[PDB]
Design a protein around this ligand. Structure first.
Ligand SMILES: NC(=O)C1=CN([C@@H]2O[C@H](COP(=O)(O)OP(=O)(O)OC[C@H]3O[C@@H](n4cnc5c(N)ncnc54)[C@H](OP(=O)(O)O)[C@@H]3O)[C@@H](O)[C@H]2O)C=CC1
Ligand SMILES: COc1ccc(OC)c(/C=C\c2cnc3nc(N)nc(N)c3c2C)c1
Length: 185
């Protein structure tokens, strides 16, 4: 089982969600970046694991659930089985990571990707050790009701670039955005 990574898209005001949806209109090519990063493994035969909260699961269009080519794990303390289509359910990120170490998953999983929401990102950021944050900066303010936490730049470094990640500004539906990668160890 490989690395632990978070991936998020965030507005200028640090917003990630509004009323259980995205604060911005759908940006298809930003979704494509997410897809590529979370699905791609260098180890043949393995899949990456995506971990998400329950609201994030239901924010994904049903036609895209489960996220194809990835093992999908939902965090909930109220559900007693995974929501229809999901592969696994855990009560906490620590328990999800424990599960990754158990025989049913330990040989299947390569990378672990935390894909939201707020509370899951916060729990991941408390994990000691190596962590990367793949942050899409949506370069406008959007009304939001759920937010990404602050990135401590005494702990994390903004990488000048990262292999396979475009540096140039992107634009879709008149909204500019860019890809960043932060690393702590
Ligand atoms: N811009 C982006 O990159 C992203 C945006 N989104 C947007 O953000 C919003 C969804 O995010 P948010 O509202 O933060 O929700 P979450 O996806 O984190 O869902 C919250 C629910 O999942 C469970 N939960 C979440 N975190 C944990 C945890 N650490 N341990 C155990 N259970 C946990 C609980 O369910 P229960 O009550 O059952 O216990 C909790 O009520 C939507 O608006 C979505 O569209 C989501 C992902 C990334
Ligand atoms: C409505 O259409 C879609 C299509 C795909 C979706 O999830 C992939 C979603 C929901 C949330 C979402 C959107 N963008 C993201 N971008 C980055 N970078 N990181 C994330 N964690 C994202 C997540 C988890 C909604």
């Amino acid at each position: 089982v490989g690395s632990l990574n978070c991936i998020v898209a965030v507005s200028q005001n640090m917003g990630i969600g509004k009323n259980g949806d995205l604060p911005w209109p759908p940006l298809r090519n930003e979704f494509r970046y997410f897809q590529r990063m979370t699905t791609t493994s260098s180890v043949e035969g393995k899949q990456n694991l995506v971990i998400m909260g329950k609201k994030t699961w239901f924010s994904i269009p049903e036609k895209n659930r489960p996220l194809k080519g990835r093992i999908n794990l939902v965090l909930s303390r109220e559900l007693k089985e995974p929501p229809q289509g999901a592969h696994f359910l855990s009560r906490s990120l620590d328990d999800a990571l424990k599960l990754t170490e158990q025989p049913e998953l330990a040989n299947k999983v390569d990378m672990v990707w935390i894909v939201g929401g707020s509370s899951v990102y916060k729990e991941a950021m408390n994990h000691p050790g190596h962590l990367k944050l793949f942050v899409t900066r949506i370069m406008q303010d959007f009304e939001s009701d759920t937010f990404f936490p602050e990135i401590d730049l005494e702990k994390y470094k903004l990488l000048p670039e990262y292999p396979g990640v475009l540096s140039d500004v992107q634009e879709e539906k008149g909204i500019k955005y860019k890809f960043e990668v932060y690393e702590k160890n």
